[PDB]
Amino acid sequence: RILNSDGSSNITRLGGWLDDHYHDLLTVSWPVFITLITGLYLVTNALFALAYLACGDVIENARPGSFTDAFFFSVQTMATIGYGKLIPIGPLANTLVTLEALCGMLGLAVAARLIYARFTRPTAGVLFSSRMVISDFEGKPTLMMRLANLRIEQIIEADVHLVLVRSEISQEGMVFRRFHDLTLTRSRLPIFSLSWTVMHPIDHHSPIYGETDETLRNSHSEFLVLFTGHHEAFAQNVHARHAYSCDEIIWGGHFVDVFTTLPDGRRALDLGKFHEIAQHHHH
Amino acid sequence: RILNSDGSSNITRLGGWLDDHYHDLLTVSWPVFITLITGLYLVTNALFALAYLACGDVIENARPGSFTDAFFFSVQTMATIGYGKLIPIGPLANTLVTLEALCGMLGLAVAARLIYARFTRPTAGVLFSSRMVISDFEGKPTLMMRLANLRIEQIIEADVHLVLVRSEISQEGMVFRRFHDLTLTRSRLPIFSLSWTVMHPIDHHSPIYGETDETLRNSHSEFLVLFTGHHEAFAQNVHARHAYSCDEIIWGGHFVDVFTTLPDGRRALDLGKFHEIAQHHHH
Amino acid sequence: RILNSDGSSNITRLGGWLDDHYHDLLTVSWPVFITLITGLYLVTNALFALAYLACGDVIENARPGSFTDAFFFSVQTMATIGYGKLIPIGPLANTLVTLEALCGMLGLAVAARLIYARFTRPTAGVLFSSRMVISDFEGKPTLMMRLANLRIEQIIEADVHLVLVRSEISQEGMVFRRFHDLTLTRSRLPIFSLSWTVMHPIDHHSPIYGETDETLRNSHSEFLVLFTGHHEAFAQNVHARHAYSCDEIIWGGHFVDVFTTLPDGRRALDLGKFHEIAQHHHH
Amino acid sequence: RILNSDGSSNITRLGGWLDDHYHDLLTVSWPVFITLITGLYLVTNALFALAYLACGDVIENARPGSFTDAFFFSVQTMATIGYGKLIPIGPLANTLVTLEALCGMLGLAVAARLIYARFTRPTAGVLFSSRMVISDFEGKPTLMMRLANLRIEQIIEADVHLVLVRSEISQEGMVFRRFHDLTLTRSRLPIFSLSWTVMHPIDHHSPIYGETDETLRNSHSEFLVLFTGHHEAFAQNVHARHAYSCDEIIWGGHFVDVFTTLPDGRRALDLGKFHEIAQHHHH
Ligand SMILES: [Cl-]
Ligand SMILES: [Cl-]
Ligand SMILES: [Cl-]
Ligand SMILES: [Cl-]
Ligand SMILES: [Cl-]
Ligand SMILES: [Cl-]
Ligand SMILES: [K+]
Ligand SMILES: [K+]
Ligand SMILES: [K+]
Ligand SMILES: [K+]
Ligand SMILES: [K+]
Ligand SMILES: [K+]
């Protein structure tokens, strides 16, 4: 497989610590992110502790020269707790308190907004069919796959972009992976609530015209699907990607109706039937 | 009705606690959201209270072994109030204070940003006409519905996507709901301030060409409308959806002019006339 | 004038307190917004003051029954200042402190995020020419207007949508304002840095084909311009709107080159020349 | 060069302090931004210090008339530290504390949200080839340039807009820079993971049809590239711009394959080969 089932590439890649700070703060794992924020919080409070000590004995009820007492006073100042046992003395420590309160209020507000950004990533909650089918629709062979909304809230302006990716030999003897846009009957669904079957009519303008299971395997053909939409639950845009290889196309298959009948005779959506494909079996 | 008047589906659906945390935090009711935040706030302060107690008697002016005194000290630390009656003693409680201040400052900032997200959902403030009409416009039968901006602020790049949804029998005997895009005379209005009448000319390319009130009812025809736009009041995008059934089309009707004359002879917008449709009555 | 110079409508409009809370919190004036936030802050602290008093004398160093002492203790609790002169006594006041700290931390965080939203509205910083011109370009009469970027930072994917708005009589004797999209030579400028002249070639497909200054005045013709783009300074989308009446079209005029020569022989942009139009004067 | 390599213009520009506050707060340098926030923090605390003094001796444990003691009490109130040595006396200072806590909580929250906005600007992390090439592709001369994703995370709905910018003489003897959209074989790549070669087939509809290296230099031809896309790492849109002059087009050159073979026989992406162009050398 060139592309994984999720649509990402398998190709190995090659060719400063804070050179991409924002990206790294978002993509780094939660234990790493936590260590970074917690360590920065502790390192800043250790730097102010040393600063208070460099002024002399400028913290009331603190043991002279005690870093521990200066650190805990710094925490009480930076977090703006201010119990009042450890309190600043003179213009030097009060100036440092004024600087530290500002750093803590600003820096902890930024750290908290970064936690929120990492936490509020919306997921499309869209299910792609495990396979694609090739069967006749309106008297023409048609490539199909389907999507379902896994949530109760609607996706507005839902778009699907289907692309064929195959190996080709150019007119000047150049071997390369080419990307062919597959024209869909409907690429935009204004309101996506339940199930959507995406169709590519295989006409003389289709890059898979006259193609068989065998010819798709020789060009190492792959089908890449991008779904985009605005999700009403999040009041944000969402996307989902997927990839099918040549062996995931059921030639002559048709998708089973997902709309089932409940015991009370009601019409329901059964996503148990979502990956079910019907085929004709010969002797 | 397959689709409700708001554009949602009526179909019954089937086929972990924190498996969709962000969606559930946004879509859950306000009393439930409040119980969750308040309970998490109280449970965290109860966990730190127990932690302070596990260290021994490390809170000044607290009754030894008192959970109540340890809980209220935890609240005073986590909220960063720090009155100074209940104060930490030793390296163990001061370390817990340092950890608790961080959790509270970060966690309460995230909870507050989540309240803001739930509170700042923009509404389009767009009124859809209670009916659609079918009457001649520029010598051609035309399907129409109308929208009005209920607010003083404008919607920029306003888009309308009108779709017919009917039951159909495919060439291979497949019964299914098909979605037909209805081509509008104008689908984009760069600046939407007052009233907008949306028109679908019923020409030989229209899916409702040669269709009558009777034929629309036999295919269980429905009309789905999606409105999108950028709202100047919110400096955010907005949308609105609506649905009409076959019995909500006034055949031969025309919308009444909404621009009324005020006593001072001034031209005004009267949204009292917005749902008024004029029809010819025969003997 | 039907439409003002800024693109808004002049039409008079007609046809619950917290029924549109979010819109009203954004569009209300700053003195009103401030009164609302400040009053809510003061009313909440007065409600907790009364609550503390209803428990009895549960505030140390407070005068029994004093609302003033209970109010200032509430402020010290809700703002999380906690000096430590006024401190809570018993399980009742400590429970109220726990509730009040939560309300204040959450509610003041939301109020502050609302101030930021009202404060960070981006302006396009785009100058529209005071007039439009009609003159020959590539041997065809062309309608033109121009825009300039007033800032050093670029606007990416800049779009212009020009529309004619005139009064018309329909085939069934209906008088109405019709919106005609005016097709531009270029409606998209990927990178907008300096000046952009927008052109509508008046060909047989133009709604202003065969139109004169006189015929535009009889239909009360107006030209509405919408500019949209992504601003690099804000890393946000921006828009600007404008409107021209029939008397703001210079028939036969051409815009003066804005690129001037500086004393050091350097080529500069002179936005002093931006509204300058050249015309031929006859005897 | 009219346009720099980054796509910005070189043209010199000409033609109130808080007249563009939000833009200036985002585009101003970090030392300037810090001085502004820090100075505003210090000036506000100096104004409350003076206010407390104007009431008389209304701060316990403060030296009468001492601005230093009133300033540090103001810092302790505005930051909500509240140690409890300097505490307010009477209805006048307690009213000022109530006002100051509100200002500090709101104003410091806004300042912190502004730091976050300045800090969380996403970069596309896209590499443009140092040159463009003109060589035959599918038996037609084709203009090409290429882009690579410098990060592991994908860009979804990646768009490329290529424009020619040359000096031209109009039919009425007008010399001006004209912007020609160059039609690409593929302008949209739904999922951009590795390398993308952008192609403009030079057919009879191309503005560079029949053009040579010499004719492109006489019109001072430049090629402007805009890349846009949605970045999965940031869950935000991104863009990148670039510009090529006439001397940056390798006539007859073709880009070298970036997909290299690793010692374990694995296929890898070598961005060391990204700027490598192959050419035929004659005697
Ligand atoms: Cl925020
Ligand atoms: Cl935000
Ligand atoms: Cl096709
Ligand atoms: Cl049609
Ligand atoms: Cl035209
Ligand atoms: Cl072309
Ligand atoms: K505090
Ligand atoms: K405090
Ligand atoms: K305190
Ligand atoms: K205290
Ligand atoms: K805070
Ligand atoms: K104290």
Author numbering:
A (entry chain A), B (entry chain A), C (entry chain A), D (entry chain A): 13 to 27, 32 to 299
Please share excerpts from the published article on this structure.
Recent structural studies of KirBac3.1, an inwardly rectifying potassium (Kir) channel homolog from Magnetospirillum magnetotacticum, have provided important insights into the gating mechanism of eukaryotic Kir channels. These studies, which involved structures of both closed and open states of the channel, identified global conformational changes associated with opening of the lower helix bundle crossing (HBC)4 gate. First, the cytoplasmic domains undergo a rotational movement relative to the plane of the membrane, a conformation termed the “twist state”. Second, interactions that link the second transmembrane domain (TM2) and the slide helix with the cytoplasmic domains (CTDs) are crucial for translating the twist conformation into opening the HBC gate.
To observe the effects of the S205L mutation in the context of an open conformation channel, we therefore created a double mutation (S129R/S205L) in which the HBC gate was engineered to be open and in which the direct consequences of the S205L mutation might be observed by comparison with our previously reported structure of the KirBac3.1 S129R mutation. The mutant channel was therefore crystallized, and the structure was solved to 2.46 Å resolution. The channel crystallized in space group P4212, with one molecule in the asymmetric unit. As a consequence of changes in the loop containing the S205L mutation, there is a change in the rotamer conformation of His177 that leads to a series of changes in the intersubunit interactions at the cytoplasmic interface. By contrast, in the S205L mutant structure, this interaction is replaced by the novel triad His177-Asp197-Arg202. This alternative pairing and charge switching, arising from disruption of the salt bridges centered on His177, lead to a notable charge redistribution, with a rotameric switch in the side chains of Glu173 and Asp175, which now point away from the intersubunit interface and directly into the cytoplasmic pore. Additional electron density was identified within the cytoplasmic cavity consistent with the presence of a potassium ion coordinated by Asp175 and Glu173. We examined the effect of these negatively charged residues on the electrostatic potential of the cytoplasmic pore by comparing the APBS calculations of the S129R mutant and the S129R/S205L double mutant. This analysis revealed a significant decrease in the energetic barrier to potassium permeation in the cytoplasmic pore at the level of Glu173 and Asp175 compared with the KirBac3.1 S129R structure. The results presented here show that the S205L activatory mutation in the CTD stabilizes KirBac3.1 in a novel high-energy open conformation and highlight an important role for the CTD intersubunit interfaces in the control of channel activity.
